[PDB]
Design an enzyme around this catalytic site. Structure first.
Site, PDB file in Angstrom:
ATOM      1  N   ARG A   1       6.758 -81.080 -25.612  1.00 57.52           N
ATOM      2  CA  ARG A   1       7.889 -80.538 -25.636  1.00 57.52           C
ATOM      3  C   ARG A   1       8.149 -79.251 -24.670  1.00 57.52           C
ATOM      4  O   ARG A   1       9.254 -78.835 -24.522  1.00 57.52           O
ATOM      5  CB  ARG A   1       8.079 -79.979 -27.122  1.00 57.52           C
ATOM      6  N   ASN A   2       6.980 -78.690 -24.234  1.00 51.16           N
ATOM      7  CA  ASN A   2       6.885 -77.440 -23.372  1.00 51.16           C
ATOM      8  C   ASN A   2       6.604 -77.917 -21.846  1.00 51.16           C
ATOM      9  O   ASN A   2       6.445 -77.093 -21.017  1.00 51.16           O
ATOM     10  CB  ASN A   2       6.036 -76.424 -23.958  1.00 51.16           C
TER      11      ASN A   2
ATOM     12  N   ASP B   1       7.854 -73.629 -20.531  1.00 55.68           N
ATOM     13  CA  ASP B   1       8.164 -72.918 -21.794  1.00 55.68           C
ATOM     14  C   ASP B   1       6.706 -71.903 -22.221  1.00 55.68           C
ATOM     15  O   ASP B   1       5.984 -72.675 -22.310  1.00 55.68           O
ATOM     16  CB  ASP B   1       8.768 -73.623 -23.010  1.00 55.68           C
TER      17      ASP B   1
ATOM     18  N   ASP C   1       0.551 -72.843 -27.000  1.00 50.10           N
ATOM     19  CA  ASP C   1       1.240 -73.848 -27.399  1.00 50.10           C
ATOM     20  C   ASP C   1       1.611 -74.806 -26.209  1.00 50.10           C
ATOM     21  O   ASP C   1       2.774 -75.326 -26.203  1.00 50.10           O
ATOM     22  CB  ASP C   1       2.879 -73.200 -27.626  1.00 50.10           C
TER      23      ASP C   1
HETATM   24  C1  LIG Z   1      13.696 -74.758 -17.578  1.00 45.45           C
HETATM   25  C2  LIG Z   1      14.230 -75.964 -17.293  1.00 45.45           C
HETATM   26  C3  LIG Z   1      14.654 -76.878 -18.048  1.00 45.45           C
HETATM   27  C4  LIG Z   1      15.296 -78.076 -17.290  1.00 45.45           C
HETATM   28  C5  LIG Z   1      15.858 -79.605 -17.958  1.00 45.45           C
HETATM   29  C6  LIG Z   1      16.000 -80.323 -17.310  1.00 45.45           C
HETATM   30  N1  LIG Z   1      16.668 -81.371 -18.296  1.00 45.45           N
HETATM   31  C7  LIG Z   1      16.567 -81.036 -19.386  1.00 45.45           C
HETATM   32  C8  LIG Z   1      16.731 -81.594 -20.675  1.00 45.45           C
HETATM   33  C9  LIG Z   1      16.304 -80.641 -21.916  1.00 45.45           C
HETATM   34  C10 LIG Z   1      15.721 -79.472 -21.505  1.00 45.45           C
HETATM   35  N2  LIG Z   1      15.442 -78.470 -22.809  1.00 45.45           N
HETATM   36  C11 LIG Z   1      15.037 -77.507 -22.705  1.00 45.45           C
HETATM   37  C12 LIG Z   1      15.139 -76.714 -24.000  1.00 45.45           C
HETATM   38  C13 LIG Z   1      13.645 -77.115 -22.194  1.00 45.45           C
HETATM   39  C14 LIG Z   1      12.705 -78.352 -22.360  1.00 45.45           C
HETATM   40  C15 LIG Z   1      11.632 -78.304 -22.036  1.00 45.45           C
HETATM   41  C16 LIG Z   1      10.993 -77.238 -21.492  1.00 45.45           C
HETATM   42  F1  LIG Z   1       9.637 -77.094 -21.064  1.00 45.45           F
HETATM   43  C17 LIG Z   1      11.747 -76.051 -21.495  1.00 45.45           C
HETATM   44  C18 LIG Z   1      13.252 -76.179 -21.833  1.00 45.45           C
HETATM   45  F2  LIG Z   1      13.988 -75.078 -21.530  1.00 45.45           F
HETATM   46  N3  LIG Z   1      15.570 -79.055 -20.460  1.00 45.45           N
HETATM   47  N4  LIG Z   1      15.935 -79.508 -19.244  1.00 45.45           N
HETATM   48  N5  LIG Z   1      14.851 -77.877 -16.040  1.00 45.45           N
HETATM   49  N6  LIG Z   1      14.355 -76.567 -15.899  1.00 45.45           N
END
Ligand SMILES: Cc1cc(-c2cnc3ccc(N[C@@H](C)c4ccc(F)cc4F)nn23)n[nH]1
Length: 282
Positions: free
Chosen positions: A152-153, A169, A148
């Site tokens: 977005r990940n 992710d 995946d």
């Molecule tokens: C694990 C982590 C997440 C952040 C961070 C710092 N600012 C943000 C803003 C949105 C976000 N959305 C979440 C749902 C997310 C997005 C992309 C991803 F790959 C994993 C994930 F959990 N995460 N996010 N720092 N460390």
């Protein structure tokens, strides 16, 4: 109770660093279980992924497995697992805080406008692409298939110069639009299936966060890709970069590059002035 193996060594819950719950403080919500910015008692800044207390028994084991999987990576382009809090509820996985946020909104929110003339150049996109390829090569060298790979990940360490991109992710819900033919028809996954997804992510980076196949539905994509259809280049995308995307989308997996070569090709692109001097569309 369940164990897990990677690069020759098996581990279990017992190997995870269980941090007391009272030493963990949440703060702001970051996105959707959900993810919070957190604090661990120069105190340490973390991200906290939560498992909702209202969930099936299946959900918890998937969650447990994720802590194990992420805890086992040691690579600079994969978000670090700080620890876990599984013994108090809700259960927590503590992850490296990535102040740059999600890769997709970043591309979408920092797209050049008359407001931000050159808020980003071609070279910045290539570096993001290289970073993720480097994490993917580490996955590939360790015989781990992500399944995946998508903007977005991916996450960024900071907004400004010097940001590093890391993988963060791990029917109708399948991300068809990032899957090669052999994945969605036969359920065959390989390191070459990650290679295909990386090509799509590459289109994602250079389109600056446009959704892939923007006017096609999932089924239209499935029919389109099978018939040999491929995405057009993102607006203003340099040919050498687009050529990497098309090679990633070779129909037969044996003809797609592994991640060492993809990395090799991205680096060559960064040494080409005609590539890196191309203006992004505004
Ligand atoms: C694990 C982590 C997440 C952040 C961070 C710092 N600012 C943000 C803003 C949105 C976000 N959305 C979440 C749902 C997310 C997005 C992309 C991803 F790959 C994993 C994930 F959990 N995460 N996010 N720092 N460390």
């Amino acid at each position: 109770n369940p164990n897990y193996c990677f690069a020759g060594k098996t581990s279990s819950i017992s190997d995870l660093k269980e941090v007391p719950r009272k030493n963990i403080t949440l703060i702001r919500g970051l996105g959707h279980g959900e993810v919070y910015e957190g604090q661990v008692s120069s105190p340490l800044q973390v991200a906290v992924k939560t498992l909702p207390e209202v969930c099936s028994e299946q959900d918890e084991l998937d969650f447990l497995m994720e802590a194990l999987i992420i805890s086992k990576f040691n690579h600079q382009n994969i978000v670090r697992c700080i620890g876990v809090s599984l013994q108090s509820l809700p259960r927590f996985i503590l992850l490296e805080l990535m102040a740059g946020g999600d890769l997709k909104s970043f591309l979408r929110e920092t797209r050049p406008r008359p407001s931000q003339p050159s808020s980003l150049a071609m070279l910045d996109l290539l570096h993001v692409a290289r970073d993720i390829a480097c994490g993917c090569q580490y996955l590939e060298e360790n015989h781990f298939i992500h399944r995946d790979i998508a903007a977005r990940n991916c996450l960024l360490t900071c907004p400004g110069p010097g940001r590093v991109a890391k993988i963060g992710d791990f029917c109708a819900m399948l991300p068809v639009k990032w899957m090669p033919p052999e994945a969605f028809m036969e359920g065959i996954f390989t390191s070459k299936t990650d290679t295909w997804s990386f090509g799509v992510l590459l289109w994602e980076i250079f389109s600056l966060g446009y959704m892939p196949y923007p006017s096609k539905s999932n089924q239209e994509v499935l029919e389109f890709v099978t018939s040999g259809g491929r995405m057009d280049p993102p607006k203003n995308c340099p040919g050498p970069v687009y050529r990497i995307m098309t090679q990633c989308w070779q129909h037969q997996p044996e003809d797609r590059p592994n991640f060492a070569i993809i990395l090799e090709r991205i680096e060559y692109c960064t040494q080409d002035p005609d590539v890196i001097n191309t203006a992004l569309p505004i």
